[PDB]
Amino acid sequence: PPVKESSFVEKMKKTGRNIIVFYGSQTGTAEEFANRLSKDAHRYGMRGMSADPEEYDLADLSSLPEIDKSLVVFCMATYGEGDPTDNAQDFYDWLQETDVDLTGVKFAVFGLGNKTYEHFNAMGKYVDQRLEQLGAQRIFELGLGDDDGNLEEDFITWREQFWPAVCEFFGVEAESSIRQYELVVHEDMDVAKVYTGEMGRLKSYENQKPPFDAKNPFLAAVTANRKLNQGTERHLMHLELDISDSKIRYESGDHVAVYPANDSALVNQIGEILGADLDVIMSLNNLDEESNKKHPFPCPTTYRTALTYYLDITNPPRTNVLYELAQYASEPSEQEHLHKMASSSGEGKELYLSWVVEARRHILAILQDYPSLRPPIDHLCELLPRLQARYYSIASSSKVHPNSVHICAVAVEYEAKSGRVNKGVATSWLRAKEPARALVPMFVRKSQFRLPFKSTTPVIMVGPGTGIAPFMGFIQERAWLREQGKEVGETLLYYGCRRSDEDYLYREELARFHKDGALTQLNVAFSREQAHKVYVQHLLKRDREHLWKLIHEGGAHIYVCGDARNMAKDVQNTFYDIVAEFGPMEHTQAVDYVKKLMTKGRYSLDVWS
Numbered sequence: 001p002p003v004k005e006s007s008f009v010e011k012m013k014k015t016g017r018n019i020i021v022f023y024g025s026q027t028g029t030a031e032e033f034a035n036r037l038s039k040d041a042h043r044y045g046m047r048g049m050s051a052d053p054e055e056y057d058l059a060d061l062s063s064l065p066e067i068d069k070s071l072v073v074f075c076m077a078t079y080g081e082g083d084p085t086d087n088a089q090d091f092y093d094w095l096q097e098t099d100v101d102l103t104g105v106k107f108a109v110f111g112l113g114n115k116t117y118e119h120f121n122a123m124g125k126y127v128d129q130r131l132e133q134l135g136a137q138r139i140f141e142l143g144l145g146d147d148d149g150n151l152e153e154d155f156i157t158w159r160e161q162f163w164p165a166v167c168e169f170f171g172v173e174a175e176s177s178i179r180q181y182e183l184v185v186h187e188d189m190d191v192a193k194v195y196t197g198e199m200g201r202l203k204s205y206e207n208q209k210p211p212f213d214a215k216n217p218f219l220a221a222v223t224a225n226r227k228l229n230q231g232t233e234r235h236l237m238h239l240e241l242d243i244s245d246s247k248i249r250y251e252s253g254d255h256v257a258v259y260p261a262n263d264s265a266l267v268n269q270i271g272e273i274l275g276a277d278l279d280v281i282m283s284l285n286n287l288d289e290e291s292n293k294k295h296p297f298p299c300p301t302t303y304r305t306a307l308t309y310y311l312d313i314t315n316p317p318r319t320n321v322l323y324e325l326a327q328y329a330s331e332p333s334e335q336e337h338l339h340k341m342a343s344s345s346g347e348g349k350e351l352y353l354s355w356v357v358e359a360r361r362h363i364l365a366i367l368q369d370y371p372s373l374r375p376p377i378d379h380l381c382e383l384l385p386r387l388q389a390r391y392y393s394i395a396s397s398s399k400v401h402p403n404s405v406h407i408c409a410v411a412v413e414y415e416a417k418s419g420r421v422n423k424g425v426a427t428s429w430l431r432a433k434e435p436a437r438a439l440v441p442m443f444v445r446k447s448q449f450r451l452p453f454k455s456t457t458p459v460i461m462v463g464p465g466t467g468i469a470p471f472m473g474f475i476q477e478r479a480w481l482r483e484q485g486k487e488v489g490e491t492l493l494y495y496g497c498r499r500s501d502e503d504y505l506y507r508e509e510l511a512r513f514h515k516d517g518a519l520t521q522l523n524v525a526f527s528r529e530q531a532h533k534v535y536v537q538h539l540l541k542r543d544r545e546h547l548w549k550l551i552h553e554g555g556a557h558i559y560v561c562g563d564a565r566n567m568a569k570d571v572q573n574t575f576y577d578i579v580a581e582f583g584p585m586e587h588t589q590a591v592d593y594v595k596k597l598m599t600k601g602r603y604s605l606d607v608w609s
């Protein structure tokens with residue numbers, strides 16, 4: 001429970017702001033959009049600020065009308081089971097319980113979500129609906145960003161209509177480059193005051209002190225890092241992180257987050273192509289001395305450290321980044337292409353989508369392919385988004401491994417249409433960790449994916465490929481429960497891989513669990529061992545009769561882990577078909593039945609894409 005700042009409205013009054021944009025963000029996307037809208041205000045003669053709702057009391061919204069022509073915008077992402085982001089949970093709870101009168105308040109909401117998930121943009125939709133129920137008036141339509149298509153474009157389209165709507169309503173009206181930070185180079189800086197990759201307090205990585213979390217990650221020693229797949233088509237790995245003496249608690253189903261380091265070669269080349277000295281110690285200080293965000297990342301620090309541990313230099317740059325960088329491209333045609341990247345349609349948009357996004361060109365690739373583009377290193381560092389932690393489904397049970405967190409991951413490495421080979425940041429970094437000291441900054445995030453409280457409750461686990469991760473923890477635990485003399489209900493695993501001799505993960509361990517009876521059934525779909533595809537859902541359909549018995553009569557809990565794009569939906573459709581045949585009942589009622597299981601905690605998801 002953080003200590004709330006004083007009234008954001010009073011802050012706005014003292015700083016001359018009329019627009020405030022709150023971000024409900026988990027991996028920084030909403031935060032970036034909010035910063036962009038906040039900065040846009042200036043171009044229309046207004047003034048804005050972005051803010052984390054967790055740091056404030058949104059009840060002060062009722063005082064916003066005290067500021068003339070005021071407006072509040074919410075850029076909100078949705079997470080686990082249509083829930084708010086962790087930083088927006090307090091606001092969400094307040095919205096549900098409050099009865100405050102928001103008459104006079106003007107608002108707009110841009111939701112960030114993904115159509116492949118169950119509750120698409122649930123948080124954005126809720127906030128938009130609730131503020132109106134409380135008496136506030138909507139100044140622009142709810143934006144529904146879909147990350148399954150192209151979120152950046154949905155944001156661009158919405159933003160392009162939003163500002164004119166705001167200008168028309170408030171009777172205001174609308175061209176230069178403005179920086180948020182000023183560069184301060186430090187000649188004789190004490191090393192003790194220089195950040196070298198820590199996320200929170202200076203030297204927190206060196207002097208570890210609990211409790212450990214996102215702000216203060218625990219550096220866990222990699223005690224094991226072995227190749228899991230038999231073949232060489234890809235690289236799947238098993239890692240074991242030593243969390244001894246960290247006081248960290250976890251359960252099977254939770255997630256472990258890690259803070260990686262970017263590839264040194266990429267960092268070196270960015271500095272090289274820009275002709276910058278990456279070992280310069282500096283700070284980027286907010287030109288707005290009132291803001292709580294004094295720096296874009298921990299400072300003072302060297303550009304090398306920033307590019308390595310604090311900045312995202314691998315994902316396709318967003319349109320505002322390319323737009324601001326255009327000024328540094330001396331070739332007219334290149335300046336024109338970069339400027340047009342922010343277009344909401346036409347050739348400029350088509351180029352952004354194909355040449356930047358589809359081609360997966362990162363910032364270095366763009367600097368190389370538009371050779372006249374040579375921005376100063378300090379401004380680039382202010383423009384780049386923050387390097388995010390990566391989440392992995394803990395693949396161990398704390399009942400069996402209380403002092404170790406296991407990770408099952410596939411290394412990301414692919415040929416992009418940009419012509420170069422792109423490497424996943426976290427997986428390339430983890431793959432290179434050699435036991436005995438290889439340390440990994442991490443923390444555990446509690447999830448709602450959990451084994452049944454009653455050991456006798458049957459469990460149906462569906463997790464092809466790396467989706468098997470949490471289930472290794474589940475199986476370890478259920479096995480442990482049997483070894484403890486407890487009565488354990490049926491435990492069925494529906495796993496899938498390409499070929500038994502290519503990438504059958506944990507083949508030996510699973511064989512052992514099956515032989516010992518920890519696994520009532522080990523159903524494996526080898527998708528490429530025959531001409532037709534054989535997937536986990538084909539096996540579920542095969543066992544429809546028994547599964548229905550377990551679900552309708554045995555109160556079984558279903559778990560689906562892995563690909564959220566196609567697998568999760570195909571599996572869900574199969575469960576619909578099963579319920580529809582044995583209920584019996586029409587598709588519509590089958591869908592409703594399965595939806596209910598989810599609300600009753602008997603159908604859990606741990607999917608990603």
Ligand SMILES: Cc1cc2nc3c(=O)[nH]c(=O)nc-3n(C[C@H](O)[C@H](O)[C@H](O)COP(=O)(O)OP(=O)(O)OC[C@H]3O[C@@H](n4cnc5c(N)ncnc54)[C@H](O)[C@@H]3O)c2cc1C
Pocket residue numbers: 255314360390391392393394408409410412414423424425426427428466469607608609
């Ligand atoms: C809740 C949750 C649980 C997860 N559990 C696990 C897990 O247990 N095991 C696991 O392996 N992963 C899991 N992940 C995924 C993991 O967090 C990372 O996204 C993954 O390891 C890649 O990270 P990276 O830094 O190596 O790659 P990044 O540098 O982040 O690159 C990822 C991006 O590469 C691009 N890309 C990948 N392949 C291609 C391609 N062939 N063509 C074009 N683009 C491509 C995509 O845009 C992808 O988003 C989980 C994610 C979430 C959210």
Ligand SMILES: Cc1cc2nc3c(=O)[nH]c(=O)nc-3n(C[C@H](O)[C@H](O)[C@H](O)COP(=O)(O)O)c2cc1C
Pocket residue numbers: 024025026027028029030031077078079080081082083085112113114115117118119120121122147151607608
């Ligand atoms: C574990 C996980 C769960 C998600 N659950 C949902 C969901 O229920 N509904 C939805 O619309 N989008 C969901 N998304 C997609 C995000 O809302 C979308 O990617 C958003 O752009 C993330 O914004 P952020 O970076 O500001 O947190 C999920 C993403 C992850 C990684």
